Amino acid sequence: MNLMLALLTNFTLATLLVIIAFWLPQLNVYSEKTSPSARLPFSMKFFLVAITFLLFDLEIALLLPLPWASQTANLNTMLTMALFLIILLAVSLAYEWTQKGLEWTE
Amino acid sequence: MWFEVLPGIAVMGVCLFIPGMATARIHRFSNGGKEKRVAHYPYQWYLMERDRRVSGVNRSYVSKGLENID
Amino acid sequence: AERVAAFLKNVWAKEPVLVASFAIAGLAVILPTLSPYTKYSLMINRATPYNYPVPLRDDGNMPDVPSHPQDPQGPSLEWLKRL
Amino acid sequence: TYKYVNLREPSMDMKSVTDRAAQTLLWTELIRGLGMTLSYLFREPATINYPFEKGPLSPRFRGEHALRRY
Amino acid sequence: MFMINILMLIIPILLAVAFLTLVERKVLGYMQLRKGPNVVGPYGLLQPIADAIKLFIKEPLRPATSSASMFILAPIMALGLALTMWIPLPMPYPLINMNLGVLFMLAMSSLAVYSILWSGWASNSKYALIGALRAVAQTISYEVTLAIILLSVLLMSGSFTLSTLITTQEQMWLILPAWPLAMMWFISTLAETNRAPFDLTEGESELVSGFNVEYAAGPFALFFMAEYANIIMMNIFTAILFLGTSHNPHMPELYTINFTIKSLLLTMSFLWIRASYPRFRYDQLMHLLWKNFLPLTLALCMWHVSLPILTSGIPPQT
Amino acid sequence: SRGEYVVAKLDDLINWARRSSLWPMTFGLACCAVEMMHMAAPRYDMDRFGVVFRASPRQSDVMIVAGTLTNKMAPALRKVYDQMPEPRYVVSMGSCANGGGYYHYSYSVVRGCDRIVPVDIYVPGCPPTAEALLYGILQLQKKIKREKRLRIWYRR
Amino acid sequence: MMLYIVFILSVIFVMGFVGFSSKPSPIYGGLGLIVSGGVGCGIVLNFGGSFLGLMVFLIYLGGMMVVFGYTTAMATEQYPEIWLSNKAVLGAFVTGLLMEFFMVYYVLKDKEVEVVFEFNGLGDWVIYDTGDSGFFSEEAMGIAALYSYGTWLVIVTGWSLLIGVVVIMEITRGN
Ligand SMILES: CCCCCCCCCCCCCCCCCC(=O)OC[C@H](COP(=O)(O)OCCN)OC(=O)CCCCCCCCCCCCCCCCC
Ligand SMILES: CCCCCCCCCCCCCCCCCC(=O)OC[C@H](COP(=O)(O)OCCN)OC(=O)CCCCCCCCCCCCCCCCC
Ligand SMILES: CCCCCCCCCCCCO[C@@H]1O[C@H](CO)[C@@H](O[C@H]2O[C@H](CO)[C@@H](O)[C@H](O)[C@H]2O)[C@H](O)[C@H]1O
Ligand code: SF4
């Protein structure tokens, strides 16, 4: 219950601050002003950094249980598979690195 | 001089100190002068529920000792 | 050799971050197989009692199973106290 | 007469290569820059308390015009 | 009683943010051989109040937003998440004692990138959106090292419970066994919060950095408060993670005093760094993450998985 | 507990906040911008008055016109002024911005920035000293202190 | 009413789904999915899946959905049509909430409805387990076992992620 109350309170206050931040200036009654999809074009590089983040982020999901995994009796198996995951994460980086997937020059 | 920066830092320090001090004091106020019980695992929660029954007042932080033995 | 030592010199001059990264990773993969205290990690994990130790029905011929927890028989944690 | 501002070839022995590796990994030259800004923090600032204090001028200063008399 | 506890956390947070703005200007001032605010209130102690009133009665900016709902959602999300990051922090006792508190903080911070994305979408400007996307790419890139570094330290702590980090450092600060991870952690927090030398949203290389360019934005104050609340929170998290304070159950206030000092000093170091260095180029800070921190962080993760096993120092699970 | 009293004290509060937190947008056009930079420099430290050095035009409350305004530049200056959120003030710094100065008779120069935007303070000099500009900024603060927006509203 | 927290959350879960399934502009479609994901995590938490719930926030919301919104901005939408300002989008949205409302009506009133499967409306709490007093989280123990029991799973999952990096670089090179 407490966590729900905390989240409700935090986002309730944030909401009130936002609306009063938008209403309080209307007290001034400032004068009227009367004076002012598709590609972006998007670079492929900015798409590829986002995708690389995602795939690296998925591999991090598999590594999060490591603190618990170290409590097992089969430590040799656990350590072998833990290093296997991190190494494949390094191999993903090495492949990206050596095919110029990490460059910003056009 | 550089020590005229301290008054603003002192205000920051007091503001950051309050949440930690408040939580500790409110916890002891609400749990009979003791630390709020930590129940991260079912076994700990199971004992806390048992204490709430054993207390006779429906509060897990009311402890019954050998006075209840007979 | 000396060709090998020269190559290690060029990377240590140009890519010290990667040299450190491969050195640290290499130790991570090698030292566990060489360490004598690795065996204790397995023993300690097996000495942690998460579950109740269900008693055995005493048929009458289990000499090495203690009848009471403080009897001499059964696995000891003397090695752990000293470690 | 002229001097070169940037024409030094770094030495390539262990002692020197490892000194540069330490700088790269341990950020030593970056830490040095922090030392300089920390030293300034403890210096008296140069700010005068205008308008109670005024920047120095000289008799030649050219300001607002005026017509004079005998 | 709990409702009092929440307000005794939220309100002081907003006051610390207010007066951090004064501390930043005075610390930056003295490192620049000047004073900073010392006229509005004694030693400038009223300057945060004058700025706050001034900003809230200022006229709202033009042009109009492209999406009203996203325009309003972004500041709510930024500030709502910023305050939420504080609820599991043990100081020494948390408001909410979570068994997975460290994971909660990772998860909530990964959601902070949405306010950047939504405010770029609601800016009604093609160039402002491109600026938001560069900021997002920076944020998520450095989230990778924060997660992996955090995982490496927890292999010495043994759980995801924030208050277990206190027990882990009862004898010694984790910065000694893990100073290489602390170095990269501290820089990642700078880059994560878009702080100098990683403050490219406030830099000179953005398509919208031109002074005469305009796009829908604001309110400025609410976004600013959210950002500075995260600066303090990250430095509080950094202290707990690497500079653990001893906790005496009978004198919790001593923990809080010592813990507050360490957080303040770390926060002041953010100001120290902003005064000392030039700004990274966008491609150079990407290179710093992907080609320096990440290879070394993966290697140190391998090391910290192996080290407890080979030394027989695996921490407890509970 | 009259409405005149409350309106009077509320005016003082908002006036205090606005003058105590003046964020300038410096339009550094020519030489006068150098003296403006010496007003931010350590000796005078404009930031100590609450006047932040470099503020974006989106959050600025005052535009300082520091230099010659040419015809080719006049449209861009008016555009920045129109985009400033209110309340907004203009300080004209130096002879060129005040009335054309040395270049008053040029075919390419606007003869005073007050042909383009309304000006609140005129700072004379070529250039005004950093202290002269600071004097002018403090003069603007007192002009803001004298404002009576809420008193006038109450008597409408 | 707090005793039906799971059911109430699952109603919001469906409403969010009707949100993005009526397919408004992709910008608001992502918003419906983000809310559904957050509610989805909430349902999993109330069954004792704390780690699983937080994975949704960290990986599904903080990872996958961030990338969706990133891609939407660059390649798809820059400004959206007003939500529910289109005939088909609004008609689909109204249709979904009517179906949800009637399912909720009959399940609560008759305490049971039947569509393909038989559903009981007593309350999701009635099926819970009545014995819990271990000194650990069973969910965490099962996930931790990935590295001891699940060697084969790690290999194929690890290989697929590596191949994903390779494949996506191939696809996007353009030559
Ligand atoms: C017994 C064996 C046990 C096994 C473990 C052994 C490990 C020890 C040996 C490894 C040492 C690891 C050091 C960890 C730091 C990471 C090093 C690093 O990546 O820095 C290099 C990086 C790039 O450097 P650059 O020269 O630009 O280019 C090189 C690439 N071509 O450049 C940088 O990152 C510079 C930093 C950029 C940011 C500058 C602004 C911040 C500077 C001020 C920070 C002050 C210190 C902060 C400390 C905080 C601590 C809480
Ligand atoms: C807001 C301000 C708050 C402060 C209040 C006042 C207290 C001040 C305390 C701050 C201390 C730092 C300030 C002094 C730094 C300046 C000293 C210096 O300049 O040393 C430079 C030295 C030489 O560098 P260099 O010339 O390049 O030589 C290279 C080959 N010899 O370079 C070096 O030798 C560097 C050696 C250290 C390298 C360490 C690398 C980083 C490791 C991170 C560990 C962080 C541990 C401390 C974190 C805090 C926890 C206690
Ligand atoms: C109860 C608390 C209520 C909230 C109160 C919030 C008060 C905010 C006071 C801010 C004080 C000024 O602080 C200063 O502001 C300017 C923004 O103009 C920042 O300036 C920075 O961002 C802007 C863009 O946003 C850049 O144009 C500028 O180059 C950069 O330096 C400074 O980094 C900051 O140090
Ligand atoms: S007024 Fe004088 S100093 Fe200023 S821009 Fe004109 S010529 Fe230069």
Annotation field: number of helices of chain E: 11
Report the helical percentage of chain E. Answer: 55-70%
Q: Roughly how many Å is the radius of gyration of chain D?
A: 26 Å
Distance between the termini of chain E: 29 Å
Biggest β-sheet description of chain E: none
Protein name (chain G): NADH-ubiquinone oxidoreductase chain 6
Subunit structure (chain G): Core subunit of respiratory chain NADH dehydrogenase (Complex I) which is composed of 45 different subunits.
Subcellular location (chain G): Mitochondrion inner membrane
Family (chain G): Belongs to the complex I subunit 6 family.
Describe the structure.
The structure is cut from a larger assembly and holds seven protein chains of seven kinds. Chain B is an all-alpha fold and 70 residues long. Chain B has one domain. Helix content of chain B is 56%, strand content 0%. The termini of chain B are far apart. In chain C, helix 1 packs across helix 2. Helices cover 39% and strands 0% of the residues of chain D. Chain D is elongated. Chain G is mainly alpha-helical and 175 residues long. Chain G has a single domain (4-169), classed as Up-down Bundle (Four Helix Bundle (Hemerythrin (Met), subunit A)), CATH 1.20.120. Chain G contains six helices and two strands, in the order ααααββαα. Chain G has a two-stranded antiparallel ribbon with strand order 1-2. The longest helix of chain G has 27 residues, at 50-76. Chain G is flat and about 60 Å long. Chains in contact: A-C, A-E, A-F, A-G, B-D, B-E, B-G, C-D, C-E, D-E, D-F, E-F, E-G. The interface between D and E is medium-sized, with 13 and 14 residues. Bound molecules: 1,2-Distearoyl-sn-glycerophosphoethanolamine (2 copies), dodecyl-beta-D-maltoside (LMT) and iron/sulfur cluster. One 1,2-Distearoyl-sn-glycerophosphoethanolamine (3PE) sits between chains E (180, 182-184, 186-187, 197, 273, 277, 288, 292-293, 296, 303) and D (24-25, 27, 30).
Task: Give a topology summary.
This is part of a larger assembly, with 7 protein chains of 7 kinds.
Chain C: H1 3-14, H2 16-34, H3 38-47, H4 78-82
Helix pairs in contact in C: 1-2
Chain D: H1 14-26, H2 28-41
Chain F: H1 3-20, E1 24-28, H2 32-40, E2 62-66, H3 74-83, E3 89-93, H4 94-99, E4 121-123, H5 130-145, H6 149-154
Parallel strand pairs in F: 1-2, 2-3, 3-4
Helix pairs in contact in F: 1-5, 2-5
The site of iron/sulfur cluster has 12 residues of chain F, from helix 4.
